[PDB]
Amino acid sequence: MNPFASLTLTTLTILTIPIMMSNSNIYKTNLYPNYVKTTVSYAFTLSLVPLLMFMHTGQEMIISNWHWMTLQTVELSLSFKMDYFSVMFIPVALFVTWSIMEFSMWYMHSD
C-alpha cells in the first residue's frame, strides 16, 4: 500500500544500521568506512523513488506513527512530514554525504 510512506521511512531507518553495528566485529576492522559508504549509497538510491513519485503526482504525506506522550489537551507523537522540501532535500543530502565519505576514505587514510 502506497510505497511512499514505506520508502520514506526506510531511507531514514537503514541509515541507523551501521550505528547499531558499531559494536560488532566490523567496527574493529578496516571494512567499516566502505560499509558506511555503501549504506549511504543504498539509502540514496532508495530515496530516489519517493522523489520520482512526487515529481509525477505531487504527493505529500504526514506519518504520525508513534504516540509519545499526551499532556492534558496537548499530544506529542513521532510525526514525519514528507512534503516537497523533505523529499527533495533528502536525496541531495544523501548524494553529497556519499561523495564526502568516498573522498574521506582517501583523505583520512592515515587516521
Binding site: 509519545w68 506522550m69 499532556l71 492534558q72
Partner: protein
C-alpha cells in the same frame, strides 16, 4: 506498603550478621532486589493515590522518588567499597548501617500520610547524613561542613513544627487527604503571612534557596562519595516534595508571597551558573550546578501550574541521576590523583577512553540535551514561566547558555588537551567504576523512552 519497609529492617541485621569478606556482596544483591520490588509502585491510578493503610500512602509524585532512593542505595554501596578497603569490619558494618538507616528514613518520609510524621522522618534523615559526613570525610573542614549542614536545616525547620501543630489545633487534623479536601483560603493578614513563611522556609532552605545555599558546597565537598550521592540525588528533593505537598493550604497567599522567592531563585540561578565558570575545584562546580537546577525547580513550584509541577518532578528525577553520575565521575579522578583541583589532571581521554565517553554522556545530559528528561522538565518549567510572564524567558535563556558553557568547560578541562607529563599512576579503569557509570546512565535513557512515569500526579 510494609513489603518494602520490612526488607530494609532485615537488611540491617543480615549486614550485621554477615562474614567479614561478604558484607558488600550481600548488601548489594539484596538492595538491588529491594529496588526491583519497589519498582512495583509505578502503577498509579489517575484518579487518586494508593492508600495502603492509615499511615502510608503512595502518589504519582512519591513513586519515582521511592524508586530513585531504592536504586540509589546499591550505587552508593558500589562506590563506597573502594576507599573503605583498609577499614575494619565493624566500621564497614557501621557505614552500611548508616546507609540503610538513611534509605529507610527516606522511604518512610516519602509515603507518610500525616504531616507530623513526615516532619519527624524528614528530620530523622539528618542524623545518619551528619554522622557520615563528619566521621568518614577526608579533610579537616568536614566538621565545619557538618555543623552548617545541621544548623542551616534546623533553624529553618524548627518554626515549621510549630506551624504544623498550630494547624492541627485549628483545622483539627494533619492528614494529607483531609487537608486537601477541607482546604480553605488564607486571608491577607500578618498572622497568615508568618504562617506562610514558617511553612515555606524549611523546604526553601532544603532546596536550597539562593540566599540560604551556603551549606550545600561545604556539605557536598567535604562528604565522602556516598554522602555526596545521597545529598545531591534524594536529600535535596525533600524540600521540593514538601513544598508540593504543603502549598495546597497556602493559597491564595502564595500569589502575593512568591515574588521575593521567585526573584531570588531566578537571579541566583543566573549567579550560580556564572559561578560555575570560575571554579578551581571540581566538586564545587557540581554543587553549584545542583543549586541552579534546584532554583529552577523552586520557580516551577512557586508559579504553581500543572505544567510547572510536571516539569518540576521530571527535573528533580533527572537532576538527581545526573548529579549522582557526575559526583561518581569526579570521585574516580580524585581517587586516581588524590586532589580535587580541576587543572591538575588533564587530557585523560588519551588515557581513559571509556571514562571520557562517560564524562561526555554525563555532560550532555547535564546541559539538557533532547530528548532526555532533563530537557523535558526544563522546557515544561520554561513554558510555564513564559505563561506566567513573557520576560522570564530572557533569564531562563541566559541560564541555558551559561549552563552549556560550564558543562563543556569541565568536559574540555579534564578530558581534552595533553596529559600533565608527571602523573604516572593513572591505572586503567576497573570494571566496578564502568558498571557504576552504566547503571547511572542507562535508566536516564530508559526513562526518556517512557516519560509519563516521572511526570507526577498532574499528568
Amino acid at each position: 506498603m510494609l513489603k518494602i519497609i520490612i526488607p530494609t529492617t532485615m537488611l540491617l541485621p543480615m549486614t550485621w550478621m554477615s562474614k567479614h569478606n561478604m558484607i558488600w556482596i550481600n548488601a548489594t544483591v539484596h538492595s538491588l532486589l529491594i529496588s526491583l520490588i519497589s519498582l512495583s509502585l509505578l502503577n498509579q491510578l489517575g484518579e487518586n493515590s494508593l492508600n495502603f493503610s492509615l499511615t502510608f500512602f503512595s502518589d504519582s509524585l512519591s513513586a519515582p522518588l521511592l524508586v530513585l532512593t531504592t536504586w540509589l542505595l546499591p550505587l552508593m554501596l558500589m562506590a563506597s567499597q573502594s576507599h573503605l578497603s583498609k577499614e575494619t569490619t565493624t566500621r564497614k558494618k557501621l557505614y552500611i548501617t548508616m546507609l540503610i538507616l538513611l534509605q529507610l528514613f527516606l522511604i518512610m518520609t516519602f509515603t507518610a500520610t500525616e504531616l507530623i510524621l513526615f516532619y519527624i522522618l524528614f528530620e530523622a534523615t539528618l542524623v545518619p547524613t551528619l554522622i557520615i559526613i563528619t566521621r568518614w570525610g577526608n579533610q579537616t573542614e568536614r566538621l565545619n561542613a557538618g555543623l552548617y549542614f545541621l544548623f542551616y536545616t534546623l533553624a529553618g525547620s524548627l518554626p515549621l513544627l510549630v506551624a504544623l501543630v498550630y494547624i492541627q489545633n485549628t483545622t483539627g487534623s494533619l492528614n494529607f487527604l483531609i487537608i486537601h479536601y477541607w482546604s480553605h483560603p488564607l486571608s491577607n493578614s500578618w498572622s497568615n503571612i508568618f504562617m506562610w513563611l514558617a511553612c515555606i522556609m524549611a523546604f526553601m532552605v532544603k532546596m536550597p534557596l539562593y540566599g540560604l545555599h551556603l551549606w550545600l558546597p561545604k556539605a557536598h565537598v567535604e562528604a565522602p562519595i556516598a554522602g555526596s550521592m545521597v545529598l545531591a540525588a534524594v536529600l535535596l528533593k525533600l524540600g521540593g516534595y514538601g513544598m508540593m505537598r504543603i502549598t495546597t493550604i497556602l493559597n491564595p497567599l502564595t500569589n502575593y508571597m512568591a515574588y521575593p522567592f521567585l526573584m531570588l531563585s531566578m537571579w541566583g540561578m543566573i549567579m550560580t551558573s556564572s559561578i560555575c565558570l570560575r571554579q578551581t575545584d571540581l566538586k564545587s562546580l557540581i554543587a553549584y550546578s545542583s543549586v541552579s537546577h534546584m532554583a529552577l525547580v523552586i520557580v516551577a513550584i512557586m508559579i504553581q501550574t500543572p505544567w510547572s509541577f510536571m516539569g518540576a518532578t521530571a527535573l528533580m528525577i533527572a537532576h538527581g541521576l545526573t548529579s549522582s553520575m557526575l559526583f561518581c565521575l569526579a570521585n574516580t579522578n580524585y581517587e586516581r590523583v588524590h586532589s580535587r583541583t580541576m587543572i591538575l589532571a588533564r587530557g585523560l581521554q588519551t588515557l581513559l577512553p571509556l571514562m571520557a565517553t562517560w564524562w561526555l554522556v554525563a555532560s550532555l545530559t547535564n546541559l539538557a540535551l533532547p530528548p532526555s528528561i532533563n530537557l523535558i522538565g526544563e522546557l515544561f518549567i520554561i513554558t510555564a514561566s513564559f505563561s506566567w510572564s513573557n520576560i522570564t524567558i530572557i533569564l531562563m535563556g541566559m541560564n541555558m547558555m551559561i549552563t552549556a558553557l560550564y558543562s563543556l568547560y569541565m568536559l574540555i578541562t579534564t578530558q581534552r588537551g595533553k596529559y600533565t607529563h608527571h602523573i604516572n599512576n593513572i591505572k586503567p579503569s576497573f570494571t566496578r567504576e564502568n558498571a557504576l557509570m552504566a547503571l547511572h546512565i542507562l535508566p536516564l535513557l530508559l526513562l526518556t523512552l517512557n516519560p509519563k512515569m516521572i511526570l507526577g500526579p498532574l499528568y
